[PDB]
Amino acid sequence: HKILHRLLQD
Amino acid sequence: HKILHRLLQD
Amino acid sequence: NSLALSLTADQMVSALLDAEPPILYSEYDPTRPFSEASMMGLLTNLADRELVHMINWAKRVPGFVDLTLHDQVHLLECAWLEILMIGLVWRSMEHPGKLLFAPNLLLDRNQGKCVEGMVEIFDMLLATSSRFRMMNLQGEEFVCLKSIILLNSGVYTFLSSTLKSLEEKDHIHRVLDKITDTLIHLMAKAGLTLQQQHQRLAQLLLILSHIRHMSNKGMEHLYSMKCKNVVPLSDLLLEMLDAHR
Amino acid sequence: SLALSLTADQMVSALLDAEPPILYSEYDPTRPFSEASMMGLLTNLADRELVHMINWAKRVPGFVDLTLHDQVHLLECAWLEILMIGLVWRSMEHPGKLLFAPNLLLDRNQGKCVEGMVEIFDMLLATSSRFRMMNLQGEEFVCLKSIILLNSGVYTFEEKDHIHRVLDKITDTLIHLMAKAGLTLQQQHQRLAQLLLILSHIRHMSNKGMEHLYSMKCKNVVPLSDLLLEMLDAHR
Ligand SMILES: CC1CC[C@]2(CO)CO[C@H](c3ccc(O)cc3)[C@H]1[C@@H]2C
Ligand SMILES: CC1CC[C@]2(CO)CO[C@H](c3ccc(O)cc3)[C@H]1[C@H]2C
Secondary structure, eight states, rough: OHHHHHHHHH | OOHHHHHOOO | OOOGGGHHHHHHHHHHHHHHHOOOOOOOOOOOSOOOOHHHHHHHHHHHHHHHHHHHHHHHTTSSTTSHHHHHHHHHHHHHHHHHHHHHHHHHTTTEEEEEETTEEEEEEHHHHHHHHHHHHHHHHHHHHHHHHHTOOOOOHHHHHHHHHHHHTTTTGOTTTTTBBBBBOOHHHHHHHHHHHHHHOOOOOHTOOOOHHHHHHHHHHHHHOOOHHHHHHHHHHHHHHHHTTOOOOOOOHHHHTTTOO | OOGGOOOOHHHHHHHHHTTTOOOOOOTTTSSOOOOHHHHHHHHHHHHHHHHHHHHHHHHSTTGGOOOOHHHHHHHHHHHHHHHHHHHHHHTTTTTTTTTETTTEEEEEHHTTSSOOOOHHHHHHHHHHHHHHHHHHHHHHHHHHHHHHHHHHHHTTTOOHHHHHHHHHHHHHHHHHHHHHHOOOHHHHHHHHHHHHHHHHHHHEEEEEEHHHHHHHHHHSSOOOOOOHHHHHHOOO
């Protein structure tokens, strides 16, 4: 789980 | 003077 | 199967300028002398907000979308502070002796003394900014440099999960080569001889090693401040930090 | 002056001629590895290499035209990047291995003998693999190593402008090498960039290695030589 993941995924 | 200094002067 | 390679130099430049993130403000409040806690809160709050716009910028860098999620993540984790820093140095170019963190947060080196150990980092950023203004760095060259950092910094640390041997990343190197081509085009277009083109290409890329050095020093300084836990860092900022140490 | 009046060919010969020798380690194979002994081998080797490196620097065109103070600073900044670029170069034809000395070739598995060291070995092994992919030439290697000496401390100290004119001469020399090898103009600028971008990774590894070395100094695993200590303390 990473904030980066959802920011990238949008 | 440091070691490097004198080795550079040699 | 990547649009990036089909772009002409003009198209590459245009796409990169179009990708640029906005300039953000710091939280207004005229209350002066900053304290250590105040300054760090301001700088980390800012960087946290810049990070969100950096992700959007990254996704608009030709060739970045073609990578897997995990590769995108690895590249951003490696390069985020270098990218914030070169951005900062760029913004600060036309204010010699000062760092333009935001339009309403213009700091001199004396103000770096507010935070223990920060002035060293301030001094390196200011030297980089003078170096850029002394080279007459252009906006078009800058966006090329910033994208090179995104794609280059983490590229040699794609190691296989077991055995940890270097996975070769042909796509990324091809895009990097396209950006190099684009930089040379800009220099030719500005009227430089071939010799001046190659000389200037080298000068600009050598600065990226200084920018790497500053990122590593800043990363250690950041980690030091979170250990003393003066400032509360956003979870995003902590995760980016945690990717290094 | 002198350095600025060299032909590209003359630059290459000068740099080639100045190369230091490859030293042997005191590795005794009848001596089981421990964290303390491996660290002792590696730092004793580094210590001896520094003496040759200091005398190599004197022979890099332009270097002795700098003040003694500037020479000291350049070497203090770049010494570990230079040892590391030499290491990776030496290791290039031994995939999976770091050739610290001809009698000391180490695996990543061997690096695990020292805490925190394996992540540094991995970065060095990856750099060696990159050199292999690019087919780095000896003439390109000596240029890059000289670029590191002159570039690494240049923005953290006029004669500073002298340093950049010599750097430009070395750039000119790399291009000459590439034109002579048959590369097109496009290929020449592209390989030039590829070579200078690895300096960013070399800096990174040097940064990391310096923190690892310092953590070993504080842990008192093995006695550090006086020169190595001074080279290390120049970074903090
Ligand atoms: C992200 C940073 C946080 C705090 C610092 C010292 O701990 C000082 O600020 C640096 C910074 C902040 C915002 C930027 O846009 C660029 C660098 C950089 C540096 C680590
Ligand atoms: C000078 C050094 C001593 C011990 C190390 C562990 O911290 C591993 O060895 C490194 C080294 C030694 C000799 C070389 O030619 C290159 C790197 C480097 C350091 C990372």
